């Protein structure tokens, strides 16, 4: 295991600057006490966390009782696909009308719910119809509640575009985050768009994002970015901690019973320079998911 792990880390771990020290320490550990996968995992996990403080980097073994399947993920989300988008304008409007639920709550508070993030190629096709369903009806409102408590996310490709409806229309765009993918040399700065289709909500009106423990992937990134940019108040539960920033590497060591290592290959550096380690968005106002809408209304009322 140790040999495969050091190789996997050197080539794929997001924080390349920690590799020299890891290569020094890992081979120097006392391994004459461990003789089971579970022990090897636990021992290396304790040492890796002491050296890295990165919870995304974790050795995990299968259920020891059924070693063909383990705690290595489930499966990538299935949202609306670009090859399945209707051609007819009436059908496209109708589909947008069921994807996005928009209400004007008493006191002129906008409510927006949607429960997936589609790829930006899909949002491109739906954009003209989203103007009618979302962006125009909420223009009258002075505050907006975005409900993501039922949103398990999807691709993050349209997250910069969506965020830009809550930003200044002008140029230059605002820096959202920077990606550093170790597997290559990404260092790609991600910016807002200078032009959106339909009316932006703007940067001034109050925005409140509702979260649950089921909130996942792109929805967590959208919530985190609305928080990191100080654009909205996050309300609800700590989110699922499922971001698409890691890859799973099996240990071909069958004596070690079905082990694998999940390695962050991507570092997400926000606009304040903070590295986000995922594990869940932490709300500004932590409440159970059922209480989040009430709490957002309270915050609005007593502003």
């Amino acid at each position, epitope marked *: 295991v140790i040999q495969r792990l050091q190789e996997a880390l050197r080539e794929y771990y997001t924080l390349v600057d920690r590799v020299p020290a890891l290569l020094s320490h890992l081979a120097a550990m006392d391994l004459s006490s461990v003789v089971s996968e579970d022990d090897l995992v636990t021992k290396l996990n304790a040492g890796l966390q002491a050296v890295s403080e990165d919870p995304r980097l974790q050795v995990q073994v299968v259920r020891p009782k059924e070693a063909s399947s383990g705690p290595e993920e489930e499966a990538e989300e299935p949202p609306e696909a670009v090859p399945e988008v209707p051609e007819d*304008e*009436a*059908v496209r*409007r109708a589909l947008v009308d069921s994807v996005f639920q928009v209400s004007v709550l008493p006191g002129n508070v906008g409510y927006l719910r949607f429960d997936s993030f589609a790829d930006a190629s899909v949002l491109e096709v739906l954009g003209p119809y989203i103007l009618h369903q979302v962006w125009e009806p909420l223009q009258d409102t002075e505050h907006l509640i975005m409900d993501l408590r039922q949103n398990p996310g999807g691709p993050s490709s349209a997250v910069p575009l969506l965020l830009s409806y809550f930003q200044s229309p002008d140029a230059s765009p605002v820096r959202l985050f920077s990606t550093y993918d170790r597997r290559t040399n990404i260092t790609r700065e991600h910016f807002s768009q200078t032009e959106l289709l339909g009316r932006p909500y703007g940067t001034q009106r109050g925005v409140y994002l509702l979260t649950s423990h089921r909130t996942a992937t792109a929805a967590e990134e959208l919530a985190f970015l609305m928080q990191s940019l100080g654009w909205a108040t996050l309300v609800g539960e700590i989110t699922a901690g499922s971001l698409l920033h890691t890859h799973t590497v099996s240990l071909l060591e069958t004596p070690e019973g079905g082990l694998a290592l999940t390695v962050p290959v991507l570092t997400f550096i926000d606009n304040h320079g903070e590295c986000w380690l995922g594990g869940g968005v932490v709300p500004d106002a932590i409440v159970l998911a059922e209480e989040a809408l009430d709490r957002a209304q309270e915050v609005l009322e007593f502003h």
Partner: antibody
Amino acid sequence: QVQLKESGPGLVAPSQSLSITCTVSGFLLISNGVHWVRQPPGKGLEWLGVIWAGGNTNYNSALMSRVSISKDNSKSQVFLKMKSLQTDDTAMYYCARDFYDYDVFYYAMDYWGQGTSVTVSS
Amino acid sequence: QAVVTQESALTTSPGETVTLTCRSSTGAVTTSNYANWVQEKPDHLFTGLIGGTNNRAPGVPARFSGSLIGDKAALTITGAQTEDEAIYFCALWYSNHWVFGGGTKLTVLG
């Protein structure tokens, strides 16, 4: 050719459950969605829900809680489960195909099944 | 809410033009509601006539047309025939659900 046939229990008791099957033929469920519609005696039509090709479902909000739709791609079957029956759930239950691959995008219920009569009584 | 209403009964005679309307409780009917018109024939024979406001299904007679008349969807029968005597249902799409109207009972004299 495109056909939809419903089959259900006929008689069901108040406060119990209802399960109906829509068997389709002439088209694949992996490519087409299916809607469930009901017609209470001497009433108009009422939409219950749809299950799209990709598996997403949408429900009439009024029913939302008591209804559940599912399918079997390989089997060419769509199912509707309805709970907490009251005698006002007495109706002709229909399945209809969902279609949108037109010249201009629009959703349409293009082919309708023949219906199945459900009597909710004690 | 999202209550669709239609006239409940209309009567015509062969060769005349009749217009059936469909109204949304929520506001003006738009293209995005994809008005569908379904025909009910004795002993629950349902046939889709028009989809997406104005698209006549291929097997339907050319005398059936659909349009947006102001704030409502309309089904016009130009030169009504005795076999047009049926119940006509209107359905409107509201982004995540369909809502059917009450139906119009059309009587054709002669």
